[PDB]
Every structure is written in C-alpha cells, then in structure tokens.
Amino acid sequence: VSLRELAEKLNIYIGFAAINNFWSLSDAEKYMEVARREFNILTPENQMKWDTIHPERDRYNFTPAEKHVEFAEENDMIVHGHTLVWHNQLPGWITGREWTKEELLNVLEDHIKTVVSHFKGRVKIWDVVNEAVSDSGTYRESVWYKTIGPEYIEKAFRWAKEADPDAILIYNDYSIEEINAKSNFVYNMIKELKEKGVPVDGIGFQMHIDYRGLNYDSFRRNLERFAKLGLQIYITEMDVRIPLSGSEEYYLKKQAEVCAKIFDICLDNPAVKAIQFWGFTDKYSWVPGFFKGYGKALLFDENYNPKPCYYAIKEVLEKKIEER
C-alpha cells in the first residue's frame, strides 16, 4: 500500500516538493515513478517563484510551472503554489532599484493577480505570503515591509482571493511549530487579519526540523489554537535532518521516531489537511547546502530505497485507519 492510498482513506493529502526540471533529470524516469506511486499533492520547489515566473518587469514565463501542473494533473495530484510574496530570490528588476509605496504596491498586485489568474482553478492551495516574520517575533524588514509597511500582507491575500475565490490561501513559515515568540506573533497577526475579514484560509508549518524533534506538547497546543481561529492546517516543507557523522543507524532510528510522532499528532487534529516533505529522496535535497554538516533528511535514500522513517509513517497511517 502506498502513502497516497492511505492518505485517501484518511481524507488527507501526502506529498512532496518537485525539483527544477525534474522531467529532464538524468534519472527523471525513476524520480517521476516514485513520485506518482507515493504522493497526491505537489509543490514546485522553485519554478513558481518570482525569478523564474516573472524574470523581467513586463515578462512572464509560465512554461516551467505548467510542466509541474501537467505532471500533477496527469497523476491525480492537486497542486500547491509557492510562493507569491517572499524576500529571497527576487529578480534584479526588483532589487536593483529604489521604490516608493505606491509603485511597489502596484507591482505586487500585478504579480499576484497575473500569476493566480493564470492558474485559476488548477492550483488548489497558494502560499500567499512566505516568511514575513523575523526570528525575534517582529516583522521581517524585507523590501516589501520597508517600502509598503505591514499592509502588504493583508493586500496580498485580498488580491489573491479576487484572482481565484476557490483557492485556499495560506501564510507559510518556519520555526513556528511550537508555541514561542515567533508563532505568538504569527498567531496575533493572523487573528487580526481574519477579524478584519482578510481571506487567510489556512496556515502552513514548514517543519524543517532535526532528529531531536520538537516539544510535542507545545506543538499539539499550537495546532489547537490555530485551528480555533478557523484555519485549515498544512505541514508544508517537512524534512528531518541528521548529522552526516557518527552512527547513521542511530540517527535514522531517531528520524523515524520523530516522523511517526509528528504524523500521530497531526492526524489527531482534523484541521490538518495535508503533510508534505521538502522533496522525497536524499539525492535531491536543499538540506546539505543550507545546514552545514547535516543531510539525509528525507523518506528515500540516494538509490530511491525506503528508509526507516518511511515505514514508521506508513504504520502510523495504517493504525489510524484501523482505529476508525
């Protein structure tokens, strides 16, 4: 039984992030086969981002993203868009010049409406605003915030909902799984947005954690408070990094325990609608390059062979189905 088959029985989605030009990889055939066999939701890792989809002020390139959508549709997967507003990897036409509030607001609205309208009805979930809060519990001083002020967030959501009323719009961020200064800020930010009628349909927890896991009680309580705001919950970029030194056997065992616990807790909260990993094979992962000294954070090894965490997750899913 595949992960997606089990997900269907529990009425949730389980998926991954698709690497750039996955269709032309030297091992594209094997990569795509594992993907279609196991998952029912796909997030383009980079090809829906600004620098790829909107390379010049008046130029739009949907070509790569369309291949991601085509693959998903052909293999019965829904698509998760990523991401409309972010501070990293912005094109030179944005970072290379000074802006005024009015000019950047027009730029932001134009981008959001064009991109969202282009995939209207084909992308079910959109990461509208990504990582807008600093790691100190304050607004991140990005070009958007510094130029426009906090209103860019509320406006991004309203514009996206206008372009596609049926799309589920979410705020996505890292290190906010537990109750802490950062998630507290996010909680108040979203509570306030929804009080004002802003269309924030859900929240996304990236889940970029390590073999040590999380404070599970805090995670459970945090999921509960966000669910009570009337939000759908998504685990969006999960990976459980382990040290590339020491006993791999020991770390993969801890990795499996962590994955099993996260799934156990998520499945117990009906607001969680999907769980995705930021890739699926250790052969293709952003972890080694970002977290020095770490890696082997995914479900399958470099040879596409399932790891301990894969079986652990599957058993948890099967257990939930039986109890129901």
Sign of CA dihedral 136, 141, 146, 152: negative
98: annotated active-site residue: no
Of the CA atoms within 13 Å of residue 147, those in its CB half-sphere come to 19
The DSSP element (H or E) to which 102 belongs, if any, is helix 101-118
Residue 247, both tokens:
């006993």
Q: Which candidate, 177, 176, 142, 140, places its Cα nearest to that of 50?
A: 142
Q: Which candidate, 284, 294, 229, 223, places its Cα nearest to that of 255?
A: 294
DSSP string, 147-189: HH-THHHHHHHHHHHHH-TTSEEEEEESS-SSSSHHHHHHHHH
Q: Which candidate, 80, 79, 83, 17, places its Cα nearest to that of 53?
A: 83
Kind of pairing, strands 13-18 and 78-85?
A: unpaired
3-state helix, strand and coil shares in percent for the chain, rounded to the nearest 5: 45, 20, 35
Residue 48 is which amino acid? M
The domain of 297 spans 1-324
Q: Which of 109, 177, 178, 237 is catalytic?
A: 237
Name the structure determination technique. X-ray
Tell me, what CATH number does 212's domain have? Answer: 3.20.20.80
CA distance 209 to 174: 9
Q: Which candidate, 279, 235, 17, places its Cα nearest to that of 288?
A: 279
Residue 160, both tokens:
């996206």
Beta strands in 76-174 (DSSP E): 78-85, 125-130, 168-173
Resolution in Å, one decimal, please: 1.8
Q: Which candidate, 321, 205, 322, places its Cα nearest to that of 273?
A: 205
Q: Which candidate, 269, 273, 270, 277, places its Cα nearest to that of 313?
A: 277
SS3 of 258, please?
helix
DSSP string, 269-317: STTEEEEEES-SBTTS-SHHHHSTTEE--SSB-TTSPBPHHHHHHHHHH
* Number of folded domains that form the chain: 1
131: annotated active-site residue: yes
Q: Which of 45, 131, 154, 177 is catalytic?
A: 131
Enumerate long-range contacts of 149-155, CB under 8 Å, 24 or more apart. Answer: 149/101, 152/85, 152/104, 152/105, 152/108, 153/85, 153/129, 153/189, 153/193, 154/193, 154/196, 154/198, 155/105, 155/108, 155/109
